[PDB]
C-alpha cells in the first residue's frame, strides 16, 4: 500500500503495551493521531528566533553599487503600448503590404504618394467596400495571410517553449483506480 | 436556462409612440388594480385611495416626456418595481419608505437657516 510508516510522521506516539494494543485494534497502525511533537513543532517560537541570524537578501545587479543605472532596469516605464488596428488602415495593410511583406516596391519618391493613397482609400472606403471591388480573390488573399486556412487563436501556455494549447493527458497513476467516477489527468 | 420569475417581463423596445402609449396605460392599470392587494400584503394602515394617489403622482412626474428611449427605461423601471412588489421581495419598511406622509418662501427659509 501507499502508506509511509508511522515512525516517520512527526506525531506523538504510543509506547510499550499501548503500542501493541493499538496496532492490534486499529484499521491502519501507520495512521497518525494528528498530535504534534512539543520538542519539534514551533520550537523555538518565532519570538525567540535571533534577529542577527536572518539576513535581508540583495541580488547582485539590482542591489549592486557599481553596475546598474536604474534606467536599464526601469521595466515599468518600458511598458508596452496597446497596438490598435482600425479598418482605415487594415485596407491599407491589404493595399500595399507591410514592412515585413510589402506588396509593391515603393521605390524612392512617387511611392510615397501611393503610400498615402493606401491609407486614404482605407479612410474613404472600409474593408467591406475594399473586398467588394477587388472581388473574391482579395478575400482569398486574406486567408493567404494565414496560409490559406483561417488563423487559429493563440493559446496561453508556452510550457513547451511556444504558446500553445496545454495537452491534457490521462495520468499514469489513477488515484481512484478505476473503481470511482473520478479520473486523473495531467 | 433558469426560469424567469412570476412577473418577469422580457425587456423589449417600444415600436412607436402608439406602442408606448398603450404600454403606459397597461402599466398604470396594472398598478391601480393591485393597490387593494398591496394593502393586505404589506399591512398598510392607510386606505387604498392614498396608495392609488401615489401611483398616479409617480406616473404624472413622467407626463411630459417626448422621447421613446426615455419612456422605455421608465417602462422598464415600473415593470421591475411591480414585479418586486407583487412577489413580496421587498418588505413593509421599503413600501412605507415610499410614503412620505423645502421652505415655502424665501423668508421662511432664511429665518430657519437654509430650509
Amino acid at each position: 500500500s501507499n502508506a509511509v510508516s508511522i515512525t516517520k510522521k512527526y506525531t506523538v506516539q504510543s509506547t510499550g503495551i499501548w503500542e501493541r494494543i493499538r496496532r492490534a485494534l486499529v484499521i491502519d497502525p501507520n495512521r497518525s493521531n494528528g498530535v504534534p511533537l512539543n520538542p519539534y513543532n514551533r520550537n523555538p517560537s518565532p519570538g525567540d528566533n535571533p534577529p542577527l541570524e536572518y539576513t535581508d537578501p540583495v541580488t547582485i545587479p539590482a542591489g549592486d553599487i557599481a553596475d546598474n543605472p536604474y534606467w536599464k532596469r526601469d521595466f515599468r516605464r518600458n511598458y508596452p503600448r496597446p497596438s490598435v488596428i482600425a479598418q482605415a488602415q487594415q485596407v491599407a495593410l491589404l493595399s500595399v503590404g507591410s514592412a515585413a511583406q510589402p506588396r509593391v516596391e515603393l521605390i524612392g519618391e512617387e511611392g510615397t504618394k501611393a503610400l498615402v493613397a493606401a491609407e486614404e482609400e482605407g479612410k474613404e472606403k472600409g474593408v467591406a467596400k475594399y473586398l467588394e471591388e477587388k472581388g473574391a480573390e482579395e478575400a482569398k488573399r486574406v486567408l493567404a495571410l494565414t496560409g490559406g486556412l483561417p488563423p487559429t487563436p493563440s493559446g496561453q501556455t508556452m510550457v513547451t517553449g511556444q504558446w500553445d494549447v496545454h495537452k491534457y493527458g490521462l495520468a499514469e497513476e489513477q488515484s481512484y483506480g478505476g473503481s470511482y467516477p473520478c479520473r486523473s489527468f495531467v | 436556462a433558469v426560469q424567469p420569475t412570476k412577473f418577469a417581463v422580457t425587456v423589449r423596445q417600444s415600436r412607436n409612440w402608439a406602442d408606448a402609449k398603450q404600454r403606459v396605460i397597461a402599466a398604470y392599470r396594472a398598478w391601480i388594480r393591485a393597490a387593494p392587494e398591496i394593502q393586505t400584503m404589506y399591512s398598510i394602515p392607510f386606505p387604498v385611495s392614498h396608495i392609488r394617489t401615489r401611483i398616479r403622482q409617480e406616473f404624472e412626474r413622467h407626463r411630459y416626456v417626448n422621447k421613446l428611449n426615455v419612456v422605455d427605461v421608465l417602462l422598464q423601471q415600473s415593470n421591475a418595481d411591480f414585479q418586486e412588489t407583487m412577489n413580496f421581495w421587498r418588505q413593509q419598511s421599503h413600501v412605507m419608505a415610499f410614503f412620505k406622509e423645502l421652505p415655502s418662501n424665501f423668508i421662511t427659509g432664511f429665518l430657519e437657516g437654509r430650509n
Binding site: 518565532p46 537578501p57 541580488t59 515599468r76 496597446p82 467516477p181 486523473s184 | 433558469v2 426560469q3 421613446l68
Partner: protein, 441 residues
C-alpha cells in the same frame, strides 16, 4: 442617442436571429433532462401568464437566517409539495460596494479588499489582484516570492476545501468530519499568523512579491504538518466515499452536462465534474505552477458525487504541490528590487535618503500603474477567479471588477435544481461551494 428620441430602427435582438431546426434529422423535443418535465408549467391547467397570476406555489424563504444558507443567501423556493418547481436566489445581502470603494484607494490600499471576497481563500484572492497589477506594472517578481505564493496558494486551497467539503457534509447530516478537519485548518492558520500577523486577512501577497519573508522555523513546521496530513484526508475519506447514505444523497444530484456547464460560465470543479479537463494553472501557468507536477481530478457524471471525489483528490494534489515547493524554495528577495514599487527595508529607509523619499511616496501617493486594462484569471479554490482592472496611469485604479466563481455558479442554480427535493437543494448549495463575500462583492 439623439435618434432614440423618436422611433428609428429597432436594435437587433437574439429573438430576431433565431433559426428553425431542420426536420430531417431532428430527434426528440428535449435533448436535456434538466427541462424534461421537472420545472414550472408541468401541472395545473392554465399558464401563469393570464388567469394564473392570482395563485402561488408554496413559496419559502430559504435563508438568510438558515444554516444551509451558509450565511447571507435569500433563496426563494417554490415547492410543489416537497419538490422544487422554481428557485430564485436573491443576493446582494452582503453587497458592500467593494468595487466602488477600490476607486478611492491606492493600489496598496485596495489589496485588503480582496482578502474579504472569498474569505476562506484570502491569499489566493490576493494573488489574482497582485498578478493583475504586476502585469500592468510590467515587472517580474522574484523566484522566492513565486514559490512562497504557490505554496501558500495551495495551503489556501486546502483551507478552502476543508471549509467547503466539510461544510457540505455537515449540511447533508455528517457532523464528525467537520470537527476533525477544523483542527487541521486551525493548524494551517498558524502558518498564516506566523508569516503575516493575522489568522484570516493576511494582506500578505501584494503586487511585487510578498510583504515580509517567512520566519526561519516555518518551512520545517510546514513539512512536519505535511507528514501527517495524508492520514487526515484518509479518515474523512473513510466516512463518506463508500458510505451508502453519502452515495445516495449525492450520486445523480445536481447533474450538469459538459456542454451546458461551459454555457453556464461554470469553472473549477463545477466544470471538471462534467468531464472537461480544464485547470487555469495548467492552461495559463502563473507564479511557480509550471515548475511543479500535479494531477487534475476530472469527473465523468457531472453530479455532486463526482464533484466530491474531485475535491477530495485536490487535497492530495495540494499536499503533493506543497512538498515540492518546500524542496524547491530558492534564496533571494521576496520583494521586487525596485523601491519605486515596493517599500524599502526599514533599515534602508532610516539609513539612506532615496530609501526615505521612496518610502514616503509609496505610503502617501502610492505607485503609479502604467495606463491600460487587463483581465487576469487564476485557478481559485472555487473556480476561475478573475479581475478586470482599468488603469489611469495614476496611483488609483479607474475600475476594479472582480469575476467571482460563485456568482457564475449560483446563477445556474435553478437550471440544475428544479425538479429535485428540498434536501437536494441543500446538497447542491454545498457542492457549488458559495461564499457570499465574492458573490455580492
Amino acid at each position: 442617442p439623439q435618434d432614440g428620441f423618436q422611433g428609428t430602427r429597432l436594435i437587433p435582438t437574439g429573438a430576431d436571429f433565431q433559426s428553425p431546426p431542420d426536420p430531417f434529422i431532428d430527434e426528440g423535443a428535449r435533448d436535456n433532462a434538466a427541462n424534461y418535465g421537472v420545472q414550472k408549467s408541468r401541472s395545473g391547467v392554465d399558464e401563469d401568464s393570464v388567469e394564473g397570476r392570482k395563485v402561488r406555489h408554496y413559496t419559502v424563504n430559504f435563508g438568510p437566517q438558515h444554516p444551509a444558507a451558509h450565511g447571507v443567501l435569500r433563496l426563494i423556493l417554490e415547492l410543489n409539495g416537497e419538490e422544487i418547481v422554481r428557485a430564485d436566489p436573491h443576493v446582494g445581502l452582503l453587497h458592500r460596494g467593494t468595487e466602488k470603494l477600490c476607486e478611492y484607494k491606492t493600489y496598496m490600499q485596495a489589496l485588503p479588499y480582496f482578502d474579504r471576497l472569498d474569505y476562506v481563500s484570502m491569499m489566493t484572492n490576493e494573488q489574482v489582484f497582485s498578478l493583475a497589477v504586476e502585469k500592468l506594472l510590467n515587472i517580474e517578481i522574484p523566484p522566492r516570492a513565486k514559490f512562497i505564493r504557490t505554496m501558500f496558494g495551495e495551503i489556501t486551497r486546502i483551507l478552502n476545501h476543508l471549509m467547503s467539503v466539510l461544510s457540505h457534509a455537515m449540511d447533508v447530516g455528517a457532523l464528525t468530519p467537520f470537527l476533525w478537519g477544523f483542527e487541521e485548518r486551525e493548524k494551517l492558520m498558524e502558518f498564516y499568523e506566523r508569516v503575516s500577523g493575522a489568522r484570516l486577512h493576511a494582506a500578505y501577497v501584494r503586487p511585487g512579491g510578498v510583504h515580509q519573508d517567512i520566519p526561519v522555523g516555518l518551512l520545517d513546521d510546514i513539512y512536519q504538518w505535511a507528514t501527517q496530513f495524508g492520514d487526515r484526508i484518509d479518515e474523512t475519506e473513510e466516512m463518506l466515499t463508500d458510505n451508502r447514505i453519502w452515495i445516495n444523497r449525492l450520486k445523480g444530484v445536481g447533474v450538469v452536462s459538459a456542454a451546458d456547464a461551459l454555457n453556464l460560465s461554470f469553472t473549477g470543479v463545477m466544470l471538471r465534474g462534467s468531464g472537461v479537463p480544464w485547470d487555469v494553472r495548467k492552461s495559463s501557468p502563473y507564479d511557480a505552477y509550471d515548475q511543479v507536477e500535479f494531477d487534475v481530478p476530472v469527473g465523468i457524471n457531472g453530479d455532486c458525487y463526482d464533484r466530491y471525489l474531485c475535491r477530495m483528490e485536490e487535497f492530495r494534489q495540494s499536499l503533493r504541490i506543497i512538498h515540492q515547493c518546500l524542496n524547491k524554495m530558492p534564496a533571494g528577495p521576496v520583494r521586487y528590487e525596485d523601491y519605486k514599487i515596493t517599500p524599502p527595508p526599514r533599515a534602508a529607509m532610516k539609513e539612506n535618503m532615496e530609501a526615505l523619499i521612496h518610502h514616503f511616496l509609496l505610503f502617501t501617493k502610492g505607485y503609479a500603474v502604467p495606463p491600460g486594462d487587463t483581465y487576469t484569471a487564476i485557478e481559485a479554490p472555487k473556480g476561475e477567479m478573475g479581475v478586470y482592472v482599468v488603469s489611469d496611469g495614476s496611483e488609483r485604479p479607474y475600475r476594479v471588477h472582480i469575476r467571482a466563481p460563485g456568482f457564475a455558479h449560483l446563477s445556474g442554480f435553478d437550471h440544475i435544481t428544479r425538479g429535485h427535493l428540498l434536501a437536494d437543494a441543500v446538497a447542491v448549495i454545498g457542492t457549488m461551494d458559495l461564499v457570499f463575500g465574492e458573490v455580492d462583492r
